[PDB]
């Protein structure tokens, strides 16, 4: 799981999760990762360097393999150039004349047979592409929502945990904007998933604590100075 945890996943939200489904050869499971090189990556399925998600893959020799030869799975072996990340190529052109024999057919078939041991068995791959960002969250975990309180409590807006107060804001958030960010790269305002109101995120009250005390060999009474904080706060 790139960028996410395999167990700490039911407590977060996502914008749009896409499950890429494809079956590759057993020994060919080496390039399913961000920034890999090879024939399969550069010809059939390439992952971007900024991929985020779990590359789920398991053995399926008992399902996608037949002793008589399961030739329903093909793979592109020849191509004019390298394949871009997240690109599909279904063309059956010959990579010359109209037919092959000299240029060859780039669509070869896998020899999926139960006789072949590990390495040549079919493996089903489910690429759960995750995109967690400032986009409005459309899918979340099974966690339930709590009552909304305003004016110093912990908040959880679409997985964004923190601590601060909530106040009625007068901003102009756009319908496609869900999270706000200030100069300090912190979240200053967030849109509630249930109600379309905008609430500012402000940290609770704090301040330096300066202790005014004489020498120990003189007395033990001390004074407290809450610098930067008024007495009414």
């Amino acid at each position: 799981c790139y960028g996410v945890s395999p167990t700490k996943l039911n407590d977060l939200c996502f914008t749009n999760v896409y499950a890429d489904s494809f079956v590759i050869r057993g020994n060919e499971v080496s390039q399913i990762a961000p920034g890999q090189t090879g024939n399969i990556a550069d010809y059939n399925y390439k992952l971007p360097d900024d991929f985020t998600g779990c590359v789920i893959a398991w053995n399926s020799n008992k399902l996608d393999s037949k002793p008589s030869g399961n030739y329903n799975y093909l793979y592109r072996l020849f191509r004019k150039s390298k394949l871009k990340p997240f690109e599909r190529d279904i063309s059956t052109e010959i990579y010359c004349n109209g037919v092959a024999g000299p240029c060859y057919s780039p669509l070869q078939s896998y020899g999926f047979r139960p006789t072949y041991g590990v390495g040549h068995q079919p493996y089903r791959v489910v690429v759960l592409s995750f995109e967690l960002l400032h986009a409005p969250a459309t899918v979340c975990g099974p966690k339930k929502s709590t009552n909304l309180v305003k004016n110093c409590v912990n908040f959880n807006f679409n997985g964004l945990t923190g601590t601060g107060v909530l106040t009625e804001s007068n901003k102009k958030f756009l319908p496609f904007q869900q999270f706000g960010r200030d100069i300090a790269d912190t979240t200053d305002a967030v849109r509630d998933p249930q109600t379309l109101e905008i609430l500012d995120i402000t940290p609770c009250s704090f301040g330096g604590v300066s202790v005014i005390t004489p020498g120990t060999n003189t007395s033990n009474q001390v004074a407290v100075l809450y610098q930067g904080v008024n007495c009414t706060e």
Partner: antibody
Amino acid sequence: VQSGAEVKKPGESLKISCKGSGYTFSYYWIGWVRQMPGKGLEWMGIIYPGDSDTRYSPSFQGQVTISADKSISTAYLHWSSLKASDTAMYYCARQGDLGDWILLGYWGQGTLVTVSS
Amino acid sequence: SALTQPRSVSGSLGQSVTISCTGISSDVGGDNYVSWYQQHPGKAPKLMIYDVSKRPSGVPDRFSGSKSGNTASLTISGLQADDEADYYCCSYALSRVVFGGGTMLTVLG
């Protein structure tokens, strides 16, 4: 050729069988499909000749188990605490090289189990 | 979901008949998970039509199928006396085997 269906009472753990031929019982899926009088076919589950990764129907998770014999290539079924509505024509089917793993290429003969008292 | 099939049809010798099949589901990987089975009354069922995009072995060419959305149809031509049998469509897109409500093919003459 299949074994006969003897009249049994609910709770005697009867057994049915079917004999197939024309293939190798090594990597071809095989299962059983019943048919009650007056209704269509009902798929229960299948079994693999190697590791028995049996996948039973949601309506047959705890009602029938597969106990097929591999040494003689003869399928068998085991029951426990049967009911009166268990009377059905059980058909033995295999994967076959015609379709996918779940597709049934060939079928058995079928035996109608009779339950009465 | 449950597959819906006509309980009884009325064909004719030399004519054609189309058996309907609705309620077919689909999963990621394809939508042609449609197969038909031929079961004679009191006899052993035999695989007749599967992967309608192709043609099974041993089955006569007078049997074919089609796909239109979630509704499938079984086109059978050249109805004869021995063609009287039960037919059921199957859907196995979600790795689960389901059958229709039963079809009885009857011919006139």
